[PDB]
UniProtKB/Swiss-Prot annotation, chain A:
Belongs to the RNA polymerase beta' chain family. Changing residue 749 to C: Resistant to antibiotics salinamide A and B. GO terms for cellular component: cytoplasm; cytosol; cytosolic DNA-directed RNA polymerase complex; membrane; transcription elongation factor complex. The RNAP catalytic core consists of 2 alpha, 1 beta, 1 beta' and 1 omega subunit. When a sigma factor is associated with the core the holoenzyme is formed, which can initiate transcription. The rRNA transcription and antitermination complex (rrnTAC) consists of RNAP, NusA, NusB, NusE (rpsJ), NusG, SubB, ribosomal protein S4, DNA and precursor rRNA; S4 is more flexible than other subunits. Zn(2+) 1 binds at residues 56, 58, 71, 74. It catalyses: RNA(n) + a ribonucleoside 5'-triphosphate = RNA(n+1) + diphosphate. This is DNA-directed RNA polymerase subunit beta'. NCBIfam families: rpoC_TIGR. It comes from Escherichia coli (strain K12). Changing residue 761 to A: Resistant to antibiotics salinamide A and B. The gene is rpoC. DNA-dependent RNA polymerase (RNAP) catalyzes the transcription of DNA into RNA using the four ribonucleoside triphosphates as substrates. Resistance to the antibiotics salinamide A, salinamide B, rifampicin, streptolydigin, CBR703, myxopyronin, and lipiarmycin can result from mutations in this protein. Its EC number is 2.7.7.6. The modification N6-acetyllysine is found at residue 969.
Curated annotation (Swiss-Prot), chain B:
This is DNA-directed RNA polymerase subunit beta. DNA-dependent RNA polymerase (RNAP) catalyzes the transcription of DNA into RNA using the four ribonucleoside triphosphates as substrates. Changing residue 18 to E: Resistant to antibiotics salinamide A and B. The chain holds residues 648 to 696 of 1342 of the full protein. It comes from Escherichia coli (strain K12). The RNAP catalytic core consists of 2 alpha, 1 beta, 1 beta' and 1 omega subunit. When a sigma factor is associated with the core the holoenzyme is formed, which can initiate transcription. The rRNA transcription and antitermination complex (rrnTAC) consists of RNAP, NusA, NusB, NusE (rpsJ), NusG, SubB, ribosomal protein S4, DNA and precursor rRNA; S4 is more flexible than other subunits. In pull-down experiments interacts with CedA. The lineage of its organism: Bacteria, Pseudomonadati, Pseudomonadota, Gammaproteobacteria, Enterobacterales. Co-administration of salinamide and rifampicin or salinamide and myxopyronin suppresses the emergence of resistance to both antibiotics.
RNA sequence: GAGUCU
């Protein structure tokens, strides 16, 4: 059975007969009365084998007494019935028939090889026109179609001088005659004279084919089939339904059409019938053969009785319901069950409730095995009945097997690996699975009737794999983010919250207790509340410089409940951890603290003990939910009446015709959105600090103990957002479109929505629930694409010896630091020796892990940016090194060799997109954007530091910015970036560049619902290409007559003014142009589409005045749905519609000639005297102002960067940082935590291939893109041995393409495009040596990674050593 | 004087399933949907209470 | 085809 690799080739007519064990010459299946195989039928026993084991048809030879005996009477071999699914057959077609995969599957293969159009070949196949195979005199050209009339011309005139024929015979003789060696030479030699792009693309692909066609051992004859193979009977079964009806596969029906038409064709050739009749039959043969192979491809698919089309052979290989995706990359499994899950709050974190009757049926063979050993059952049949009767002795044995024998639990959907965890079973009474509450987060399992699948690890390997890797207690941190997934929620948080939180006096204030046990004594004795301020003696163990724990006793001012909670806390943590009122966010840090200080064992016990006490004290509290708990502020009707009058004001000014519809729409949303903020601020102010209590002194106040508030403040369930809808204001509801409804709901759920308010609410309800069902498939398809590219990637090496990495500046974006350097750089090998500011003593070694200890020192010395070893920068050919990846985020320590990073990386990206599509959608009703970013207020004092800014001073006396991507920093005392903002175009700065500002100062100010076009020069406005009706429109009012002009774009524009560009040209008093300072550019600002203009022609202007106002309608609430397409496009490496232009080579710019508006740039670098020219559109106003020392990758046009242009000009590290930052910004908007290394994993696979420019010393030469890994292994031998070095360029690939580019065709055909992959592999004669995981999962082998890593490399040394 | 017609009943925008939800006015549309759909799945008991 | 968990 065992083997090395699998190969695909075309089937020779000779090869098809080798597989066959007899020819099916009849369409008959079975005799209707004596149900047996028919004489040379589709289900023939003489050809495919006997129905019973070792039994001929007539029944002359039975059983193994006659071993290898072929009966003389019926003609049937006495062998196993197994031979019926294995032996194939054949049909000798009277006439050749083209294979549809080597005809329709574009590129046509048969057409690409003949250089003859597919249309032209089909005319020959359906007998419309003849084709010249070999015109003796070159009067008749080869491969020239002759019509039926044009065939009659040559017939009388020439006759034998030409051999033009028709049908598949003609195309096969045409493929026979062609010489691959002679035509290939000619294509090579005749490409030299022209040398273009599409010739060199198509002629080089033809050379690659002709060369691969020879070396593959394939012949172009085999494109056309002379022989048709038959599938074995058992694989297309005719089996009896329980009742007398039978059932058959759709292949039997397609085989019968082919045999009937082939047999009839032979008879019509015997009858020497006219060709008209013979042709019709040849057409029908082609149709039946093409329908057998791929039904729905050439024409209308042949439907059977049901009206649906008959399922073809190709169909059982292709797509989802194909063998690959459904019966091979995934399977039905023995020793599996499922049931409705329920809580098990008594259970430990390593346990799960497994029902009696489930476990009985699950562990059947292990019980029969113990029953023989204990001597209770003689045979297995005896043991079977003992278990079926459910004897008392059997329950005791079942209990014996299950101890220390884990079970796997799974939930749909399996988004990430924690969707399967291992537990030790606890047998229970009922029929329902009991799941541990803490792992509920990983499964996303709520008990409202979820079902979870059970799997028994049978083998000892599997019991150890379950216990060592997949056990719940082993899997605490998330592999996506270095943070615990096992984190208490719901009642547990609420209980520890209620315990720790303090209250005014209460029972027994200012007491003094001996220990945490006397605190439990006064609480259970009923002399103290959990909230009483008390002095308590507590002894905290803090860890020393060495491993030893140091004990420290001290009086602590904490409540009774806080003292009781310290009892759960292990020795190692400070008492400071339980001294605060604990919520969900703090409790998560408790187990993260405990994990890094103590270990795994303490955390598992601590996490449990937290769970137990948390539930218990939640129950003690009697926290509840009443209608009075939903307090509404008394001043709500006051806020609404004010806000109603404000909105009525803009609507009354709209009737006057002062404000437009779009302006009112955006302006009204801002008033209501701030009113919802006002009501909610009043609600949370009248809710949070509402408790005013009388202490033993006089009177004071504290946080309210309103039951709903506690539930949202603790973070147990709900948030302030939900409480708005309950007590405050419901808010702006979202349209199904995504845009915001202008009328928001004033009322809340306590007050009740009226008939219309509900009807408005439903718009947003259905759209959310709609995305939960529909849009999950776009997101889940991303998970799939990401896995297929990263699949094969595994840690292969300990240390690559590379010195490279990506420089990780801290993500300080939008005032507060969004992600510190510490978080981003934690658990990563220090690429370069990064010391302290004073470069005179190294602080951190080059090859060392970044532990939280080292990360704390980075904050002490204030390391700003750190170069860090990345996955992308690894120089490992085989996979990746342990150092480049760094820490396993799930384990908190160095990653192991053998662990499969590709799949872990794809899952971590794919999961939150997929699950969040179902999260804030079922939960979502209301819209809540606040995109009203009017002004930046700086918060700390600093010097103003702008970058990538070019501003100009206006008439008012204000620094107006005339650059798109302007950034504003906030520099402290010593000189480091604390805050960062995005200042937009046409914004008014308070203070210019370098000036000091105070804290709480408006440093910038602008209008958000408008993108102004601001001038750089003063003078008068001129109208150019601004014809009324063609390019712009006009609308006037009354008495005086103020008219506004609105620029039409290609949508609202006629064919007349299409190539006209509308622009407001600047001129002086005389009428001439005004040059922009220090440039030869006459001043001309191009207005885009839908640009509203107030100033008409002939108006005086200063510099800094707004010429036109481009509307900025973006009222869509950004959920996962609007950001995921961005993420998909980034990973798929798509250029945008308007890519920004970048400088290719460093050197001195000179502007050049022009094409009727379109610019040219003949840039002549200092070193490279040879020039580089490139065309630029008219309308793109350039950032660079010509004659300047421009370097590689300098933004010339403003706008979005193609990731191709980044990698091409600024290397790998630039494009990696572009993808990581751009993708991660989308997930950061939604609060999703994904480490950069997981994106970096997939980026590495995107940077797989590379195009070879200069010739090598192998067979790369020019144009042939090969994998990076392969060309480097050649370069290692070339640098030492010598000969021609191969110059290269790394190319970027999208996911869907990088997956199909892999050499493993089995990986490619299992992904997508199954029909195309198999044909391109068949013609190239490719051999897949089963490299990656998909390949071994298919063949049913051990994975070449994880536990099997060690085993696969052991086979690989057997292969090397002899 | 500008009013031409009026809704006949308070219940007319809702269905038969949703009419049987008490205090529907204080329920979210998302939960109200599932509630009306599960009310249909409610198996009748031994004693009709 | 009508549902259940996401
Ligand atoms: Mg739930
Ligand atoms: Mg559920
Ligand atoms: Zn026989
Ligand atoms: Zn490496």
């Amino acid at each position: 059975e065992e083997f090395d690799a699998i190969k695909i080739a075309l089937a020779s007519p000779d090869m098809i007969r080798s597989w066959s064990f007899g020819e099916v010459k009849k369409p008959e299946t079975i005799n209707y009365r004596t149900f047996k195989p028919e004489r040379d039928g589709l289900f023939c026993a003489r050809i495919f084998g006997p129905v019973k084991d070792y039994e001929c048809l007539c029944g002359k030879y039975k059983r193994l007494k006659h071993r290898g005996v072929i009966c003389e009477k019926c003609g049937v071999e006495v062998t196993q019935t197994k031979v019926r699914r294995e032996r194939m057959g054949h049909i000798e077609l009277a006439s050749p028939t083209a294979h549809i995969w080597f005809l329709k599957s574009l590129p046509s293969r048969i057409g690409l090889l003949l250089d003859m159009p597919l249309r032209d070949i089909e005319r020959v196949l359906y007998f419309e026109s003849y084709v010249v195979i070999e015109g003796g005199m070159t009067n008749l050209e080869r491969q020239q179609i002759l019509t039926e009339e044009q065939y009659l011309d040559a017939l009388e005139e020439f006759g034998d001088e030409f051999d033009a024929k028709m049908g598949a015979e003609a195309i096969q003789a045409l493929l026979k005659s062609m010489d691959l060696e002679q035509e290939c030479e000619q294509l090579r030699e005749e490409l030299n004279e022209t040398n273009s792009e599409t010739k060199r693309k198509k002629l080089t692909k033809r050379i690659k084919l002709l060369e691969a066609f020879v070396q593959s051992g394939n012949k172009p004859e085999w494109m056309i089939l002379t022989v048709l193979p038959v599938l074995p009977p058992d694989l297309r079964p005719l089996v009896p339904l329980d009742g007398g009806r039978f059932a058959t596969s759709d292949l039997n029906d397609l085989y019968r059409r082919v045999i009937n038409r082939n047999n009839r064709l032979k008879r019509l050739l015997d009858l020497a019938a006219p060709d008209i009749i013979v042709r019709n039959e040849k057409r029908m043969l082609q149709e039946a053969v093409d329908a057998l192979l791929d039904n729905g491809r050439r024409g209308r698919a042949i439907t059977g009785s049901n009206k649906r089309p008959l399922k073809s052979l190709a169909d059982m290989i292709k797509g989802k319901q194909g063998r690959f995706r459904q019966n091979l990359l995934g399977k039905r499994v023995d020793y599996s069950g499922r049931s409705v899950i329920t809580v098990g709050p008594y259970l430990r974190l390593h346990q799960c409730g497994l029902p009696k009757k489930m476990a009985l049926e699950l562990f059947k063979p292990f019980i029969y095995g113990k029953l023989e050993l204990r001597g209770l059952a003689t045979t297995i049949k005896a043991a079977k009945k003992m278990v079926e009767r459910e004897e008392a002795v059997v329950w005791d044995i079942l209990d014996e097997v299950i101890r220390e024998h884990p079970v796997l639990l799974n939930r749909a959907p399996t988004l990430h690996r924690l969707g399967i965890q291992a537990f030790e079973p606890v047998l229970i009474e009922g029929k329902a699975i009991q799941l541990h509450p803490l792992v509920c987060a990983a499964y996303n399992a709520d008990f409202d009737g979820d079902q979870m699948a059970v799997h028994v690890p049978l083998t000892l390997e599997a019991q150890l794999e379950a216990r060592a890797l997949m056990m719940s207690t082993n899997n605490i941190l998330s592999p996506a983010n270095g943070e615990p997934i096992i984190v208490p929620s719901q009642d547990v948080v609420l209980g520890l919250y209620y315990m720790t939180r303090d209250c005014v006096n209460a029972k027994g204030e200012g007491m003094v207790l001996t220990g945490p046990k006397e605190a439990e004594r006064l609480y259970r004795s009923g002399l103290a509340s959990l909230h009483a301020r008390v002095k308590v003696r507590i002894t905290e163990y803090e860890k020393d410089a060495n491993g030893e724990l140091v004990a420290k006793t001290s009086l602590k001012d904490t409540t009774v409940g806080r003292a009781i909670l310290w009892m759960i806390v292990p020795k190692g943590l400070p008492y400071s951890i339980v001294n605060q009122a604990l919520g969900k966010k703090a409790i998560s840090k408790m187990l993260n603290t405990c994990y890094r200080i103590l270990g795994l064992k303490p955390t598992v016990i601590f996490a449990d003990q937290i769970m137990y006490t948390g539930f218990a004290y939640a129950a003690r509290s009697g926290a509840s939910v009443g209608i009075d708990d939903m307090v509404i502020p008394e001043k709500k009707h006051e806020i609404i009446s004010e806000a109603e009058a404000e909105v009525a004001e803009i609507q009354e000014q709209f009737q006057s015709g002062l404000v437009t519809a779009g302006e009112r729409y955006n302006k009204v949303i801002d008033i209501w959105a701030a009113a919802n903020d006002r009501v909610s601020k009043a609600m949370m102010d009248n809710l949070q600090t509402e408790t005013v209590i009388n202490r033993d002194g006089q009177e004071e106040k504290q946080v309210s103990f309103n039951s709903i508030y506690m539930m949202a403040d603790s973070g147990a369930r709900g948030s302030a957002a939900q409480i708005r809808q309950l007590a405050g204001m419901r808010g702006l509801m979202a349209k199904p479109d995504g845009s915001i409804i202008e009328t928001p709901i004033t009322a809340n759920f306590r007050e009740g929505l009226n008939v219309l308010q509900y009807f408005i609410s439903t718009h947003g309800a259905r759209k959310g629930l709609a995305d939960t069902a529909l849009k999950t498939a776009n997101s889940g398809y991303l998970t799939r694409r990401l896995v297929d590219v990263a699949q094969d990637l595994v840690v292969t090496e300990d240390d690559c010896g590379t010195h490279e990495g990506i420089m990780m500046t801290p993500v300080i974006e939008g005032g507060d630091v969004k992600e510190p350097l510490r978080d981003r750089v934690l658990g990563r090998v220090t690429a370069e020796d990064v010391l302290k500011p004073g470069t005179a003593d190294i602080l951190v070694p080059r090859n060392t892990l970044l532990h939280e200890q080292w990360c704390d020192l980075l904050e002490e010395n204030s390391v700003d940016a750190v170069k860090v070893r990345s996955v992308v920068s690894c120089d490992t050919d085989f996979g990746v090194c342990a150092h480049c990846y760094g820490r396993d985020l799930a384990r908190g320590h160095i990653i192991n060799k053998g662990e499969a990073i590709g799949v872990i990386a794809a899952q971590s990206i794919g999961e939150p997109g997929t699950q969040l599509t179902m999260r804030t959608f079922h939960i979502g009703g209301a819209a809540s954007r606040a995109a009203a970013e009017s002004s930046i207020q700086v918060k700390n004092k600093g010097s103003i530091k702008l970058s990538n800014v070019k501003s100009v001073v206006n008439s008012s006396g204000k620094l107006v910015i005339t650059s798109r991507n302007t950034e504003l920093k906030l520099i402290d005392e010593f000189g480091r970036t604390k805050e960062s903002y995005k200042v937009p175009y046409g914004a008014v700065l308070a203070k210019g560049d370098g000036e000091q500002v105070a804290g709480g100062e408006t440093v910038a100010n602008w209008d958000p619902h408008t993108m102004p076009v601001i001038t750089e020069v003063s003078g008068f406005v001129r109208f150019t290409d601004m014809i009324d009706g063609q390019t712009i429109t006009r609308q006037t009012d009354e008495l005086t007559g103020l008219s506004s002009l609105v620029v039409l774009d290609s949508a609202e524009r006629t064919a007349g003014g299409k190539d006209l560009r509308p622009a407001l040209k600047i001129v002086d008093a005389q009428g001439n142009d005004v040059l922009i300072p220090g440039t030869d550019m006459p001043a001309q600002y191009f207005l885009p589409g839908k640009a509203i203009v107030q100033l008409e022609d002939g108006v005086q202007i200063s510099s800094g005045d707004t010429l036109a106002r481009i509307p900025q309608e973006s009222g869509g609430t950004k959920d996962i749905t609007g950001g995921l397409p961005r993420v998909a496009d980034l990973f798929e490496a798509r250029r945008p519609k308007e890519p920004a232009i970048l400088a290719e080579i460093s050197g001195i710019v000179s502007f050049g000639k022009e094409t009727k508006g379109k610019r040219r740039l003949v840039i002549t670098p200092v070193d490279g005297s040879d020039p580089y020219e490139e065309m630029i559109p008219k309308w793109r106003q350039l950032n660079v102002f010509e004659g300047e020392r421009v370097e590689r990758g300098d933004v010339i046009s403003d706008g979005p960067e193609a990731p191709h242009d980044i990698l091409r000009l600024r290397g790998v590290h630039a494009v990696t940082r572009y993808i990581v930052n751009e993708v991660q910004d989308v997930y950061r908007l939604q609060g999703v935590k994904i480490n950069d290394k997981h994106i970096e994993v997939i980026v590495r696979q995107m940077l797989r291939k590379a195009t070879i420019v200069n010739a090598g010393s192998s067979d790369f030469l020019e144009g042939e893109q090969v994998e990076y890994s392969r060309v480097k292994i050649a370069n290692r031998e070339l640098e030492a041995n010598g000969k021609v070095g191969a110059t290269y360029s790394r190319d970027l690939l999208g996911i869907t393409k990088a997956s199909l580019a892999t050499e493993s065709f089995i990986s490619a055909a299992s992904f997508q495009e199954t029909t195309r992959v198999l044909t391109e592999a068949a013609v190239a004669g490719k051999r897949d040596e089963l490299r990656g995981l998909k390949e071994n999962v298919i063949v049913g082998r051990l994975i070449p990674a994880g536990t099997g890593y060690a085993y696969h490399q052991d086979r690989m040394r057997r292969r090397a050593a002899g | 004087d500008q009013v031409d017609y009026m809704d006949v009943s308070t219940q007319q925008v809702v269905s038969v399933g949703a009419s049987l939800i008490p205090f529907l006015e204080h329920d979210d549309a998302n939960r109200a949907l599932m509630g009306a759909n599960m009310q249909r799945q409610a198996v009748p008991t031994l004693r009709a209470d």
